[PDB]
Paper text:
We adopted the Z domain of staphylococcal protein A and its affibody binder dimer complex as a model system. We next generated libraries at the interface of a weakly associating dimer (Z+ ZSPA-1) with micromolar affinity to determine if we could affinity-mature the interface by coevolution. From the structures, we could verify clear compensatory changes between the residues showing the most significant covariations (13A-9B / 17A-31B) in both LL1 and LL2 library mutants.
The three orthogonal mutants, LL2.c17 (VFLV/IVVY), LL2.c7 (LVLF/FIVK) and LL2.c22 (IVFF/FILV), were selected to compare differences in their affinity and structures. Each Z-A mutant binds to its binding partner with nanomolar affinity (3.98 to 44.2 nM) but has minimal cross-reactivity with other monomers. The backbone structures of the three mutants are relatively similar (Cα r.m.s.d. of Z-A after aligning Z-B ranges from 0.447 Å to 0.641 Å). Additionally, the same compensatory mutations (positions 17A and 31B) as LL1 mutants are also seen from LL2.c7 and c22 mutants. Binding of VFLV/IVVY and LVLF/FIIV are highly enthalpically favored and entropically disfavored, but by the end of the trajectory we see a more moderate enthalpy of binding coupled with a moderately disfavored entropy in IVFF/FILV. For example, A-LILFK has more Z-B binding partners (B=77) than A-LIFFK (B=15) from the LL1 library, and A-LVLF (B=53) and A-VFLV (B=42) are also more cross-reactive than A-IVFF (B=3) from LL2 library sequence data. We do not observe systematic differences in the structural parameters of the interfaces mediating specific (A-LIFFK in LL1 and A-IVFF in LL2) versus cross-reactive (A-LILFK in LL1 and A-VFLV, A-LVLF in LL2) complexes.
Numbering used by the authors:
A (entry chain A), B (entry chain B): 0 to 57
The structure:
């Protein structure tokens, strides 16, 4: 029984998501809720966040 | 069993922390880990981060 805490992965995804300047507040809240519920999916969530950030660039 | 909506508080307070220009990279990351781990402490953490930022001003 391996205890995977994902400390590095979570903290990296959080820091990067906060720096994506084109996300809205609702989007950040959705990503953080999904990460808290399933921290194994940090890479999926960060990739999606980056894609939305870029789609919402002025 | 109250849901304290601390996911939304993490999002709002975290953004404020990362927008403090005079904090360094490990300082902002230390604040964010504490916030993620205990979002009930958001106001205390934000206050501490603001005082630290305002004090490290050029």
């Amino acid at each position: 029984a391996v205890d995977n805490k994902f400390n590095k992965e979570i903290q990296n995804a959080v820091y990067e998501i906060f720096h994506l300047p084109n996300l809205n507040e609702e989007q950040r809240n959705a990503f953080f809720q999904s990460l808290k519920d399933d921290p194994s999916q940090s890479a999926n969530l960060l990739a999606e966040a980056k894609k939305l950030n870029d789609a919402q660039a002025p």
